[PDB]
């Protein structure tokens, strides 16, 4: 009864529900079980004295010692870390039965190797290899499986990367990424949600389970959210229906739920966060991750006004988490215009006239000028420009208004149809004047044909000057605001003291 036994072999690759994912698809840090299985002992071996699997397990799976002896009975397991190589040798126990009854057919049993896939957009091949009786021995046939995340991969080829992307936008839908935006305009943030590379996954349940999940951290020290205005599309252009939609302040503010996702996909927000979430993991699966249709989230924030006294830029993230994995969004950035008015008292009603700093006394009875210089709106802008209006409020007292007052262009200002106003131009017929004598005060109006008129790629700062005459000696207040877009605007002296 010599020649030791020689059964085929088959490797088989299964997932944690354990059915067959040989060449397909499934989810970074799924559950991945191979089994070595080998055909039945034939009647007229020889006695079977050492049985053993030796599988080198592929680069980026992770090997579950304790799981995969769970799941070896007859085997002792023993793994080499260097080489990531598991080994199971038939347990004496095991041999006896190989060899309990020369003549006639026994069945074998089998180890599985329990692990999960580490690393996106990789494949993942295995193979084993039996040795019998320490000599004669066999390599098996080479599974395999692909994490979603990689072009041009021939097993999935709707396979590409992961990449949630962020754009930002004006109400008129153009693209405002890098662009100044005035105080109260809003940023009509597109956020995708990339699933499309997920098509045909075939991932256990408890993998599913795990959820979706996006979410937004925007900036709350600029930015305030209309989440009233929240739109979310799939790509087909349907209305979305499972997802829910929540803020909050913090982290630690956010429940026991939040905190652990984001925990394990390793995302801590700054401060504030907005969080799209998967109602039944199930049914999201089940309509757009596993027919690879990406969605659409719309999520608007307004500009707070407290930004336009300081200004300064603001940035906005995104994350995707899917199957309990984290990716990354593009960040995009825009930045605030410090709105810095300016109040003077002037002699003359000259644009160009000389920059005296002197302690401005105004004799009895002298007819001045209010010089109130405009906000500085810079080149490529957010919006249209609307609403620019100088209000003052003078004390009657001292000051009585002669009833006389002029506006200049005082940058170079571009119009849509391309025509350019020099810095100095006289613009007081694209103005008009509200006046309460009684209250003692008067706004100045630019039109709103003529600002909606201005390119919004066009720098725009205009200033006015007020006719007055001092009737009375004695200090005097003044106020003036600058109103821009809605947003006020408190002016300071032209000259600190
Ligand atoms: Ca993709
Ligand atoms: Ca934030």
Do not use: C
Request: glycine content about 6%; overall charge negative.
């Amino acid at each position: 009864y010599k020649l030791a036994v020689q059964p085929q072999v088959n490797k088989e690759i299964k997932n944690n529900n354990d059915v067959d994912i040989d060449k397909t698809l499934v989810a970074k840090q799924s559950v991945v079980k191979f089994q070595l299985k080998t055909a039945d002992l034939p009647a007229g071996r020889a006695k079977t004295t050492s049985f053993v699997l030796v599988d080198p397990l592929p680069s980026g799976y992770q090997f579950n010692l304790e799981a995969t002896k769970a799941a070896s009975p007859g085997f002792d397991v023993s793994y080499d870390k260097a080489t990531n190589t598991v080994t199971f040798k038939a347990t004496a126990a095991t041999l006896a039965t190989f060899n309990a009854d020369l003549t006639k057919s026994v069945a074998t049993i089998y180890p599985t190797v329990v692990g999960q896939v580490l690393n996106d957009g990789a494949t993942y091949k295995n193979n084993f290899t039996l040795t019998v009786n320490d000599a004669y021995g066999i390599k098996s046939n080479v599974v395999r499986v692909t994490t979603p995340g990689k072009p041009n991969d021939p097993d999935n080829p709707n396979n590409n990367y992961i990449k949630p992307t962020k754009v930002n936008k004006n109400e008129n839908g153009v693209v405002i990424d890098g662009k100044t935006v005035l105080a109260g305009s809003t940023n009509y943030y597109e956020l995708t949600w990339d699933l499309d590379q997920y098509k045909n996954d075939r991932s256990s349940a408890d993998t599913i389970q795990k959820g979706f999940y996006y979410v937004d951290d925007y900036p709350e020290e600029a930015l305030e959210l209309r989440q009233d205005l929240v739109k979310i599309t799939d790509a087909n252009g349907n209305k979305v229906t499972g997802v829910s939609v929540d803020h909050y302040t913090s982290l630690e503010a956010a429940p026991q739920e939040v905190r652990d996702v984001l925990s394990k996909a390793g995302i801590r927000p700054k401060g504030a966060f907005q969080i799209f979430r998967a109602d039944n993991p199930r049914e999201f699966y089940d309509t757009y991750v596993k027919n690879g249709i990406d969605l659409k989230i719309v999520s608007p924030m307004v500009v707070k006004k407290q930004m336009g006294q300081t200004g300064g830029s603001y940035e906005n993230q995104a994350y995707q988490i899917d199957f309990g994995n984290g990716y990354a969004s593009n960040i995009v950035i825009n930045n605030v215009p410090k709105i810095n008015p300016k109040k003077d008292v002037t002699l003359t009603l000259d644009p160009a006239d000389t920059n005296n700093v002197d302690g401005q006394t105004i004799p009895l009875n002298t007819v001045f000028n209010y010089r109130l210089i405009g906000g500085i709106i810079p080149a490529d802008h957010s919006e249209e420009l609307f609403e620019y209006n100088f209000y003052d409020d003078y004390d009657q007292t001292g000051d009585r208004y002669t009833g006389q007052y002029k506006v200049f262009a005082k940058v170079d200002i571009t119009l849509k149809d391309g025509s350019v106003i020099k810095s100095g131009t006289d613009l007081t017929q694209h103005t008009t004047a509200e006046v309460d004598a009684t209250k003692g005060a008067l706004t100045i109006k630019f039109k709103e044909d003529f600002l909606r008129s201005v390119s919004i790629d066009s720098a725009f700062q205009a200033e006015s000057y007020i006719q007055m005459k001092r009737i009375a000696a004695g200090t005097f207040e003044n106020t003036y605001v600058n109103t821009v877009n809605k947003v006020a605007y408190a002016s300071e002296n032209l000259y600190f003291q």
